[PDB]
């Protein structure tokens, strides 16, 4: 059955810290504990070892990722930007 109506994972904190902070941290708690698909092997095993460090239990490949998400929007934008400049550097 559905046990909570809205708190979800942040139900571990009971009534403490205020609704808005619990609401805000709920997005991170889900993301930082999710298992992401590993781009190197495909098994849904990529898990966070520490803040910024993401490890896959299948192929053992460790990746420097985001604090709470596997890759950040800023980092993904920079990779495309660095790709384009490289092409326009060597044509």
């Amino acid at each position: 059955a559905k046990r909570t109506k809205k708190v979800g994972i942040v139900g571990k904190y009971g009534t403490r810290y205020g609704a808005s902070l619990r609401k805000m941290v709920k997005k991170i708690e889900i993301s930082q504990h999710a298992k992401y698909t590993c781009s190197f092997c495909g098994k849904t095993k990529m898990k966070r070892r520490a803040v910024g460090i993401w490890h896959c239990g299948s192929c053992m490949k460790t990746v420097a990722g985001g604090a709470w998400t596997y890759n950040t929007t800023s980092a993904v934008t920079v990779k495309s930007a660095i790709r384009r400049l490289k092409e326009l550097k060597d044509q």
């Binding site: 810290y17 910024g52 490949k61 460790t62 800023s74 400049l85």
Partner: protein, 248 residues
């Protein structure tokens, strides 16, 4: 009066950094012939957590060009690098995430991290998690480049300064509420003795300029001049303004 807490921090003692479990100093390679003329290859062996630092650290291994040895380097981990990846450092390295190049050869708009303040110093700027610097322009005649630092300041640096392409990993760390004095206790138990912080108004006049009074009030303007003696320079030090920053 007595010496105030801010004064006592500079004497070391119970205010020194907690470096027991740190993994070493995170630096670029020491610039040598290979990086001055071409490039050198290296392989990322591990990405490790460093206590007291938000960003992860990469453990890259190079071949010694003069001896039969392996050199282990402790880099700042640019976001997106993985173990087993090849990274290349030098003048002729290719513009890929994780490569170390002189900023002179980088085109305008390049995003870099762990950027040398001066040529050869092995990386000083934009090393905090998530941060980076951009390249604005080059002046080949004077051999100098213009970069934008994470604080927003623009600096003119030597073109020969090396730097890592990409942004430091572990970004967005400050987007999570701590939610707990205990969680903030653990954050600083790995850094230094700076927590918790006791307000000046909550002390006696003996140990703070703001202390004392039958009401908890500062009692004097909190903007203190830049030249105030140690033990008096508390509050808003040399503030150009105060209040809410409204607008740009």
């Amino acid at each position: 009066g007595r010496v105030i807490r801010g004064q006592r921090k500079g004497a070391g003692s119970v205010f020194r950094a907690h470096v027991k479990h740190r993994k070493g100093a995170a630096r670029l390679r020491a610039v040598d012939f290979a990086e001055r003329h071409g490039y050198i290859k290296g392989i990322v062996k591990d990405i490790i957590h460093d206590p007291g630092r938000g960003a992860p650290l990469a453990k890259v291994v190079f071949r010694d060009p003069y001896r039969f040895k392996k050199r282990t380097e402790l880099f700042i981990a640019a976001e997106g690098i993985h173990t087993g990846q090849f990274v290349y450092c030098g003048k002729k390295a290719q513009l890929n995430i994780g490569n170390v190049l002189p900023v002179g050869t980088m085109p305008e708009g390049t995003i870099v991290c762990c950027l040398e303040e001066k040529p050869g110093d092995r990386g000083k700027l934009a090393r905090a998690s998530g941060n980076y610097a951009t390249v604005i322009s080059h002046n080949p005649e004077t051999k100098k480049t213009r970069v934008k630092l994470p604080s927003g300041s623009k600096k003119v640096i030597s073109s020969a300064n090396r730097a890592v392409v990409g942004v430091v990993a572990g970004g967005g760390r400050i987007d999570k509420p701590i939610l707990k004095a205990g969680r903030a206790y653990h954050k600083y138990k790995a850094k230094r003795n700076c927590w918790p912080r006791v307000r000046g108004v909550a002390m006696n006049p003996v140990e703070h300029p703001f202390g004392g009074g039958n009401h908890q009030h500062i009692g004097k303007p909190s903007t203190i001049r830049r030249d105030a003696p140690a033990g008096r320079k508390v509050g808003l030090i040399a503030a150009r303004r105060t209040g809410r920053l409204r607008g740009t």
